[PDB]
Amino acid sequence: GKKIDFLLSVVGFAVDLANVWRFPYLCYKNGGGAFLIPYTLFLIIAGMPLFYMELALGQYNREGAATVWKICPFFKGVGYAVILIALYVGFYYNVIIAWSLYYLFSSFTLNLPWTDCGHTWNSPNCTDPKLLYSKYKFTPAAEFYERGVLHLHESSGIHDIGLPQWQLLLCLMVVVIVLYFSLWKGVKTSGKVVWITATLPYFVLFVLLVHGVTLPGASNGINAYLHIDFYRLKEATVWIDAATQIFFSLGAGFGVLIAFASYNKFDNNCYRDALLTSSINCITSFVSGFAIFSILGYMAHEHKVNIEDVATEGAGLVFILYPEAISTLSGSTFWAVVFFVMLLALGLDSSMGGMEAVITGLADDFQVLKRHRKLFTFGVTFSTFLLALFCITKGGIYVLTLLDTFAAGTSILFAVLMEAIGVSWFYGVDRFSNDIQQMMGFRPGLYWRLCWKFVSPAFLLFVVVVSIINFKPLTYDDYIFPPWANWVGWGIALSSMVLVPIYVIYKFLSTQGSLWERLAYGITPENEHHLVAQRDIRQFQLQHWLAI
Ligand SMILES: CN(C)CCC[C@@]1(c2ccc(F)cc2)OCc2cc(C#N)ccc21
Ligand SMILES: [Cl-]
């Protein structure tokens, strides 16, 4: 049972809300197949080494994202930045679960609300295919999602978000209460019910793929998926999106991996964990893209519109597609219930992990918080509840888009780049390899060390620079955000990006001694500060820097 339980755990942890909800619309927005080349390249080159490095760090040091930097005290700022990024993401990661809960609640009927027009929320322009460069938006499913769930028609933009919707308010309240009561007692919350949540997503994806392949218009969608438009690979939007989606789905850059590995056994095999998780994530992403493109090709055939204009490119793509695929099934009510229960469970577990990252990171830093986990959990959950209250308004989709674009974009890329640079160069790739050997029994191969030291940081810096200089103003379908919205988004990104130099400056000023003494104390492990007085620093010799 050692291997079967491990396989269940790894397959459960290998699929996130990202793979199911965010990958579809990022793949649709980027042409389809053309998005998989950057995705797979980045996956290997950066994602696999960074996943492995974070797991090894957490396992060896037994600390959260913040306090794990006792090895290189100057990067506690990086730790704080990743914790803040996780906190930001949790603001809308819960609104998505609220949407899923609302859909599940509305799915308990023999006549699904997303099948035809004729309801209170339908506009006079609603078009029913059975009864008779834009994105359409006049279909029963799109009309339902945008009017009877979001009530987006009552807001003119991000300047007129309006008051919170009370149905989504109740759903968010339920989600937050469940999260708190699942986090308040301790980290140990697995091995009890995750069995169903680890297999259900794969079953749902399998059934959807099998059913969608046999649809009238699925062939065109599959052709559009397997057709690669190489012109799109010279714009850098696809590359930025692929990198960000990778660091989202894999879980790196949020401090989740370090916090969760801090509870692993000292002899746990992180290399096999990273390899298996990366392979599963790649296969799942490819299958999900295939099924999504099949579904939207079927819809394009159904609605007599081009595949590029059939559906939205925003965060509601799954809530438009999956109900439309369910409506084509027999006993569609049961399938809808099953799918949305799956989505609820997956989102709940993912948000639970994201919030546990923050809780552990802050509790390891301050012992008072670690002594009062109940109050700290309540405070974190209440803050998330309010800042997600901000995202359930009538124009809440615009705020959600702004967050999903800015909270972890260049910010998460920069945080991961700083993590990699810090460890590999200042702490030492040789030291990290020695630690991994002492931990798991074998030294990492040359490929891993090269990826950690040279390849991954270079690509991360390149993508960060390109995202900064090649920045497209924010938009949501046909709505162009005003400039101050972009300024606010860049301020949000900087809020977590700037914690690195700020903490470096604070650490330098707070330390006592000469400039060289300050540097030595800053770039030396906290448990080896007794060598600073002996003027024996490895970082001050060229051998340390040229070591690979
Ligand atoms: C952006 N989000 C927040 C990242 C979440 C990462 C994740 C995680 C933690 C440790 C790992 F080794 C691997 C993945 O946290 C828990 C979890 C649960 C599921 C489920 N079902 C899926 C992923 C995770
Ligand atoms: Cl993904």
Side-chain angles (χ1 to χ4, degrees):
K2 150 64 207 184
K3 300 304 173 46
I4 203 84
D5 216 69
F6 154 66
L7 282 205
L8 215 74
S9 73
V10 65
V11 302
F13 274 78
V15 163
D16 191 24
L17 248 182
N19 302 84
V20 181
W21 154 73
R22 201 162 184 274
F23 182 86
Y25 80 77
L26 284 175
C27 171
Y28 179 43
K29 168 158 105 67
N30 286 305
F35 177 72
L36 282 297
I37 271 66
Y39 186 86
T40 321
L41 223 34
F42 260 105
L43 169 60
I44 290 146
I45 279 296
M48 221 164 50
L50 256 292
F51 193 90
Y52 187 7
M53 145 172 305
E54 265 169 12
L55 280 187
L57 259 182
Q59 192 168 298
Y60 184 75
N61 295 112
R62 311 256 137 212
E63 291 294 297
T67 48
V68 68
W69 283 115
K70 59 187 182 182
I71 61 180
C72 207
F74 269 148
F75 296 77
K76 205 166 207 184
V78 180
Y80 293 140
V82 295
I83 286 163
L84 186 56
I85 289 161
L87 185 81
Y88 278 156
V89 165
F91 293 162
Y92 71 85
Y93 227 60
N94 294 21
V95 169
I96 292 141
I97 304 161
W99 294 350
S100 298
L101 182 56
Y102 181 98
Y103 262 85
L104 173 54
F105 152 65
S106 100
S107 326
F108 284 145
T109 36
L110 281 201
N111 282 326
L112 288 311
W114 55 75
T115 36
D116 36 8
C117 317
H119 303 91
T120 78
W121 60 78
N122 288 119
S123 53
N125 282 318
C126 196
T127 279
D128 190 2
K130 315 183 319 293
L131 204 63
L132 189 65
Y133 302 92
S134 94
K135 304 257 94 190
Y136 203 26
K137 289 317 154 263
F138 296 139
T139 63
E143 287 278 73
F144 173 67
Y145 169 72
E146 294 223 337
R147 304 179 69 94
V149 188
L150 301 192
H151 295 65
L152 180 60
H153 61 291
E154 270 135 47
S155 166
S156 32
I158 193 159
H159 69 101
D160 188 18
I161 57 172
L163 280 173
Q165 193 46 53
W166 71 268
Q167 296 121 298
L168 297 175
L169 175 57
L170 299 174
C171 289
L172 181 69
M173 196 169 347
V174 169
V175 162
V176 154
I177 289 162
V178 166
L179 280 172
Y180 171 84
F181 274 111
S182 100
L183 281 159
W184 77 321
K185 238 37 173 169
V187 322
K188 174 43 58 203
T189 193
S190 317
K192 186 195 285 154
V193 282
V194 79
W195 191 325
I196 211 81
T197 312
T199 283
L200 201 49
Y202 298 92
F203 175 67
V204 165
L205 290 185
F206 177 60
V207 57
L208 245 66
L209 174 46
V210 173
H211 180 258
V213 172
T214 62
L215 281 173
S219 81
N220 298 129
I222 292 163
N223 287 338
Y225 190 55
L226 301 182
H227 174 87
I228 281 141
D229 41 70
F230 296 103
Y231 85 83
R232 207 169 218 131
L233 293 170
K234 318 158 44 177
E235 287 327 284
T237 301
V238 65
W239 299 91
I240 296 154
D241 280 10
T244 319
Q245 176 59 14
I246 278 175
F247 288 127
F248 253 79
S249 82
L250 270 178
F254 304 92
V256 184
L257 298 186
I258 298 162
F260 271 99
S262 58
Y263 301 113
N264 273 349
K265 316 202 333 297
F266 200 69
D267 42 280
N268 167 275
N269 198 327
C270 291
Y271 159 86
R272 157 228 293 174
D273 263 22
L275 227 50
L276 220 75
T277 284
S278 290
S279 321
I280 290 163
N281 155 107
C282 167
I283 300 279
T284 293
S285 286
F286 179 105
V287 160
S288 180
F290 200 89
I292 279 284
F293 256 84
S294 175
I295 290 297
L296 50 95
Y298 154 74
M299 306 168 13
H301 168 87
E302 180 202 342
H303 292 119
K304 308 292 154 213
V305 317
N306 298 330
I307 297 192
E308 323 96 18
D309 308 293
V310 68
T312 174
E313 260 149 46
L317 175 59
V318 296
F319 296 98
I320 302 328
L321 295 184
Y322 278 69
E324 190 133 314
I326 289 153
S327 300
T328 45
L329 285 162
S330 33
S332 53
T333 299
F334 156 78
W335 282 114
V337 168
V338 156
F339 168 47
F340 287 117
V341 158
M342 176 278 269
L343 217 42
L344 252 178
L346 179 48
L348 281 168
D349 308 341
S350 301
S351 184
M352 204 201 297
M355 293 210 24
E356 170 69 17
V358 178
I359 291 165
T360 290
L362 279 315
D364 287 24
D365 223 21
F366 310 93
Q367 264 57 42
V368 55
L369 299 176
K370 171 168 317 184
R371 250 194 302 289
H372 295 122
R373 199 204 160 71
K374 264 171 217 193
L375 275 143
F376 189 39
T377 311
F378 167 79
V380 174
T381 42
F382 202 54
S383 47
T384 295
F385 172 74
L386 300 170
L387 281 310
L389 226 64
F390 251 113
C391 275
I392 52 166
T393 46
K394 272 77 191 310
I397 190 63
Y398 306 122
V399 184
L400 191 139
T401 290
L402 189 149
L403 280 177
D404 184 57
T405 297
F406 282 101
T410 303
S411 49
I412 184 136
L413 295 167
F414 176 77
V416 167
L417 171 72
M418 279 338 270
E419 279 182 11
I421 294 266
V423 178
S424 298
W425 294 81
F426 288 78
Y427 176 61
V429 67
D430 45 285
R431 282 194 68 149
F432 197 58
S433 319
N434 290 340
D435 302 344
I436 284 161
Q437 165 156 65
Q438 183 215 144
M439 186 187 356
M440 293 180 357
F442 52 80
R443 196 154 155 122
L446 167 82
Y447 162 76
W448 295 106
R449 301 204 301 277
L450 288 172
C451 269
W452 291 334
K453 196 169 173 75
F454 300 100
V455 187
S456 292
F459 275 73
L460 280 160
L461 184 87
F462 170 83
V463 76
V464 164
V465 167
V466 168
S467 80
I468 279 159
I469 68 192
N470 295 90
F471 160 77
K472 312 281 110 202
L474 191 56
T475 57
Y476 176 75
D477 291 354
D478 307 331
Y479 173 67
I480 319 275
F481 285 63
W484 61 262
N486 300 276
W487 304 341
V488 165
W490 276 118
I492 287 169
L494 291 167
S495 63
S496 71
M497 283 178 86
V498 80
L499 291 185
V500 182
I502 292 294
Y503 187 93
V504 165
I505 291 159
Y506 152 78
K507 173 59 70 177
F508 185 92
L509 298 147
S510 60
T511 309
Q512 333 200 324
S514 67
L515 154 76
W516 294 128
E517 276 200 0
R518 305 206 140 123
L519 262 279
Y521 274 106
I523 54 132
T524 284
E526 280 212 338
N527 78 48
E528 319 185 352
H529 278 351
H530 59 39
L531 280 142
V532 173
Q534 328 189 318
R535 290 183 68 82
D536 286 329
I537 311 268
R538 79 183 53 212
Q539 272 82 221
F540 291 179
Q541 305 301 86
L542 191 57
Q543 312 289 9
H544 166 89
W545 295 105
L546 311 180
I548 301 166

